[PDB]
């Protein structure tokens, strides 16, 4: 179909691709600069389709198929002439139906798929080819057809339903494993790609798929089973309820696989994953079935015993360092599975089945089962905390006896649990089980025990210490410390390292109680450092945490020598980060005396925090293996593939956070760096579209930088620059969580910069940003079923409220004008609770600045509704609005405020209860506002009602009004309720009303005055003396 000249030019080029730099680079330029142009592109696509279809050379065929796939997207296929699309399609199809190597048929299939499209003409020859190939006796034809149905799931819609059903059923049951896997993959891909409204049309095939599964175990084809479990895992995340009717059968099947422990791990790990993922996607369904929980606990307990296989003494485990053995695959998987399901389902549902088994495993003569027991509890404790936090003596009764098990791995197991639960049941467990936990861990520290066990116990003392007060640790310190010094003398590096960190963290919790241990510890530490990088880092960490615990005066006995060692250490990669945190901690200890060390510490942080977005424009194939590295990720942004060096950008964050924390501590003393950090780090960081941590860390740096310069023209320039990039980010930023940080960052910027810190264009550009943010939140939220059982959004709206309020205040009202343009938006929200709360909160801010009449009619009907809402947050925002009406718009509002006033006397009356103490306090303030505005114009029972709502202890601005009103009830024997109403507010720290009160007590004898405080305990009488 091509001129013969064109053919050997193109042939030469494509053949040059395999090869030398010269021949191959000349071809590369030729292709990209000469052949992919409006004028040659169709010739090029025609050629490549011909080669892939007909070439007898493997390499040329393959390459052309790949190239065609790549270039056919870019063209794109849509702007190709009809006569040439047709010809390309026809040859691609003839190639597919001819004799090709498997991998070329795969590449042809991928090329064919690029030629099937919404706006492209119908290709009914494809449809026909796929149906016939599916019946071919050649697996490669069957497999390749399902591969095309995977790339282009719309084709499945286009075949008659009575053909496509038997196609998949024959597919699931095919003699070829490869065809099975491709059938499964195409079947699940359909649900991946199509709207839910199309799902019911293949959904009916699920039981045929599930019914095909036992055959994989009959044939002993477990690797193939694993891949099918993988597709099934993706189907659970898309349509868990499709599994409802056969739920027991899948549970029992996964059970059966995992028990067959001659199977290789992949079938067993993916089976477990399939089990696990129901708890994440259909928690009601798992909970409505006692079998799920029982099987899930049983099979993770089986897998947790699979340790030290063929090594009963644990010699290998005893002899190694305190890391995980990465050969213990099923055991690792079982621990994260139990944890994951516990976290989803809660203890109400799993503790019973869990405990049924543990009671029994604790007593086995198989050590593996006694260990399993401890590790299973360790996995489940957090998710089951709601129940287990109450059964804490019972748990210690089981665990603590094992601390002395003959087998050192069971001992390590028990250390593990005491550690895990010191975290998960904190702070309650530190208060109530210190007397059992500490002696138990401390007994393992002795050099009688194995290195692994001493180390594990020392690690568990970090978990305990984290949430133990200095007073609880105090009687245990000398004993803790004398033991850990012995650990410090071990011959094993990892015991020393753990010893050091354990002492550091105990010292952190001990605080000033650690002062007496400083003189024994500090020289031991100095000696280690003067002499094993990690040891030195953990040692400097230990020293500076001891520093922070004992305070600056005591830290001064060794600070200069310690600082000189740091210097030597820094200027000489796990080390880097211990060094930087230690400098940062010295800054917290020394305060302003750190200032002379800034030139040592800051420059290296400047370098790291200037890191650029290190991107590599990359190719499809050349990814995946790039992805292997934990330090790289690849994403698709606009069609193309990009490799981004993630670690480097994480390090840029880390450095930005340290700069941020120096700037926060040093305030005006950091000013010298502000310009440079702002222009070279904070601001360019907002443009880092490939890493959101950077963008957020850039945003939080902004207000802090400004505030440093403030405390020490530029300020105004930088603020203008920074606010404008913040504003601009609001219309472009794709991630809602980042959007939030920008609003918060504006709010904090405004708070720093003060009055009228914004210009008119900025106020207008902010409005558009606020509107686009509101528009996209609406859109995402009007998207939340047959198949299935967002604080992110709530939080973003929370902050938008703050920024609007903040902008209103800095403009001193003038932002009302701009605010008018998004009123339709606001109004839709007002009439789904999160959108409502938002809108009410906005309107309360509006009124704060009688020019709102324009909207009285548009909102009070819904606000009055909201007053009696079942949701406390709605009532709260509602009443605030009614109260603010009478405060700032007294007169354009009365026909409303006085009517509602009875509503408020009722909302006022589970009122005084934690959950809604806040809502009823606003109503209370709201009625006091009405009573003020229209003072002796009111039809007075009211005020005596209002009174019985005192005290106001939770909402501060409410309390502030109520006691202002209280200060404008008299005499009587209301007197002790009058006073206490005030003592309560003060003591609870929610709120000159004192002056008013002392006047009332003036009107009574010596003895009558005194007696009122007679009820108050010593501590609040100390305060009352200092108040009156």
């Amino acid at each position: 179909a091509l001129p013969e000249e064109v053919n050997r030019t193109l042939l030469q080029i494509v053949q040059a691709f395999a090869s030398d730099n010269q021949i191959r680079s000349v071809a590369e330029k030729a292709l990209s600069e000469e052949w992919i142009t409006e004028n040659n592109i169709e010739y090029l696509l025609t050629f490549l389709a011909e080669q892939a279809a007909f070439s007898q050379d493997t390499t040329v065929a393959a390459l052309s198929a790949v190239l065609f796939r790549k270039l056919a997207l870019k063209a794109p296929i849509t702007h190709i002439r009809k006569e040439v699309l047709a010809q390309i399609r026809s040859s691609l199809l003839k190639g597919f139906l001819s004799e090709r190597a498997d991998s070329i048929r795969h590449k042809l299939s991928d090329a064919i798929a690029e030629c099937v499209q919404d706006d492209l003409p119908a290709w009914p020859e494809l449809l026909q080819a796929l149906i016939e190939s599916l019946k071919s006796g050649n697996p490669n034809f069957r497999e390749s057809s399902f591969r095309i149905l995977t790339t282009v799931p719309y084709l499945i819609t286009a075949v008659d339903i009575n053909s496509i059903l038997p196609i998949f059923q024959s597919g699931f049951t095919d003699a070829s494993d490869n065809v099975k896997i491709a059938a499964v993959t195409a079947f699940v891909g359909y649900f991946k790609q199509l709207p839910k409204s199309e799902w019911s049309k293949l959904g009916i095939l699920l039981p045929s798929l599930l019914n095909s599964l036992p055959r994989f175990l009959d044939d002993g084809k477990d690797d193939a089973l694993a891949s099918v479990f993988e597709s099934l895992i993706e189907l659970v995340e898309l349509a868990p309820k499709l599994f409802k009717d056969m739920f027991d059968q899948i549970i029992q099947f996964t059970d059966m696989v995992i028990k067959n422990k001659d199977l290789e791990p992949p079938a067993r790990t993916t089976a477990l994953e399939l089990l696990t993922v129901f708890s994440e996607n259909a928690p009601q369904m798992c909970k409505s079935n006692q079998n799920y929980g029982q099987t899930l606990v049983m099979v993770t307990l089986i897998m947790m015993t699979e340790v030290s296989i063929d090594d009963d003494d644990a010699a290998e485990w005893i002899e190694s360092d305190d890391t995980d053995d990465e050969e213990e695959v099923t055991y690792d998987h079982a621990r994260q599975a139990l944890d994951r399901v516990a976290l989803k389902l809660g203890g109400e549902y799993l503790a019973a089945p869990l405990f049924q088994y543990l009671q029994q495993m604790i007593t086995s003569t198989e050590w593996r089962e006694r260990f399993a027991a401890m590790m299973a509890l360790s996995s489940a404790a957090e998710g089951c905390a709601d129940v287990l936090i109450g059964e804490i003596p019972k748990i210690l009764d089981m665990v603590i006896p094992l601390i002395n098990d003959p087998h050192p791995r069971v001992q390590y197991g028990c250390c593990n649990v005491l550690g895990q639960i010191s975290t998960d049941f904190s702070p309650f467990i530190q208060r109530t089980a210190h007397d059992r936990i500490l002696p138990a861990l401390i007994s393992k520290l002795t050099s009688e025990c194995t290195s692994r066990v001493q180390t594990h116990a020392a690690a568990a003392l970090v978990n305990f210490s984290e949430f133990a007060s200095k007073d609880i640790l105090e009687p245990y310190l000398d004993s803790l410390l004398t033991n850990l010094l012995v650990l410090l003398q071990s011959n094993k590096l990892y015991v020393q390292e753990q010893a050091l960190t354990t002492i550091a963290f105990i010292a952190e919790a001990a605080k000033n109680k650690f002062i007496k241990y400083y003189d024994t510890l500090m020289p031991l530490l100095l000696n280690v450092l003067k002499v094993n990088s990690v040891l030195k880092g953990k040692c400097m960490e230990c020293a500076t945490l001891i520093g922070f615990a004992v305070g600056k005066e005591k830290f001064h006995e060794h600070s200069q020598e310690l600082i000189s060692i740091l210097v030597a250490l820094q200027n000489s990669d796990a080390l880097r980060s211990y060094l930087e945190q230690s400098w940062s901690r010295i800054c917290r200890i020394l305060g302003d005396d750190f200032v002379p060390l800034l030139p040592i510490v800051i420059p290296p942080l400047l370098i790291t925090a200037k890191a650029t977005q290190d991107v590599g424009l990359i190719e499809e194939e050349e990814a995946a293996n790039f992805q292997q590295y934990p330090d790289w990720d690849v994403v698709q942004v606009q069609g193309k593939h990009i490799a981004i060096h993630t670690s480097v950008l994480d390090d840029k964050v880390s450095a930005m956070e340290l700069l941020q924390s120096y700037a926060t501590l040093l305030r005006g003393q950091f000013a010298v760096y502000v310009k440079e950090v702002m222009e070279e780090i904070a601001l360019p960081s907002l443009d880092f579209y490939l890493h959101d941590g950077v963008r957020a860390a850039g945003a939080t740096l902004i207000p802090i930088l400004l505030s440093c310069l403030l405390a020490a023209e530029e300020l105004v320039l930088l603020w203008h620059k920074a606010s404008s990039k913040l504003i601009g980010g609001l219309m472009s930023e794709p991630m809602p969580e980042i959007t939030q940080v920008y609003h918060n960052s504006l709010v904090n910027g405004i708070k720093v910069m003060g009055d009228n810190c914004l210009s008119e264009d900025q106020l207008a550009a902010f409005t558009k940003g606020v509107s686009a943010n509101l528009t996209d939140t609406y859109e995402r939220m009007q998207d939340r079923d047959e198949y299935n059982e967002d604080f992110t959004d709530e939080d973003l709206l929370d902050e938008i409220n703050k920024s609007i309020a903040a902008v209103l205040k800095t403009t001193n009202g003038h932002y009302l004008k701009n605010l008018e343009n998004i009123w339709p938006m606001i109004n839709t929200f007002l009439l789904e609770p999160i959108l409502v709360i938002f809108a009410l909160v906005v309107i309360g801010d509006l009124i704060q600045y009688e020019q709102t009449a324009s909207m009285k009619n548009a909102f009070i009907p819904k606000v009055t509704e909201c007053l009696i809402s079942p949701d406390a947050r709605i009532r709260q925002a509602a009443s605030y609005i009614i109260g603010v009406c009478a405060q700032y718009a007294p007169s354009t509002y009365a026909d409303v405020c006085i009517p509602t006033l009875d509503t408020l006397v009722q909302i006022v009356d589970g009122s005084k209860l934690e959950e809604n103490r806040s809502s009823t306090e606003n109503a209370s303030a709201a009625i006091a506002k009405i009573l003020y505005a229209y003072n002796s114009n009111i039809p007075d029972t009211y005020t005596a009602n209002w009174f019985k709502t005192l005290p106001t202890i939770t909402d501060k601005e409410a309390a502030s009004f109520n006691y202002q009103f209280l200060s404008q009830v008299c005499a009587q024997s209301n007197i002790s309720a009058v006073v206490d109403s005030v003592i309560q507010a003060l003591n609870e720290r929610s709120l000159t009303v004192i002056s008013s009160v002392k006047k009332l007590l003036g009107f009574l004898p010596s003895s009558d005055a005194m007696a009122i405080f007679n009820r108050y305990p010593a501590d609040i009488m100390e305060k009352v003396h200092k108040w009156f």
Partner: peptide, 12 residues
């Protein structure tokens, strides 16, 4: 990690 903690989740 120099305290007790759980292994990282293995999903996607």
């Amino acid at each position: 990690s120099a305290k007790i903690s759980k292994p990282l989740h293995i999903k996607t």
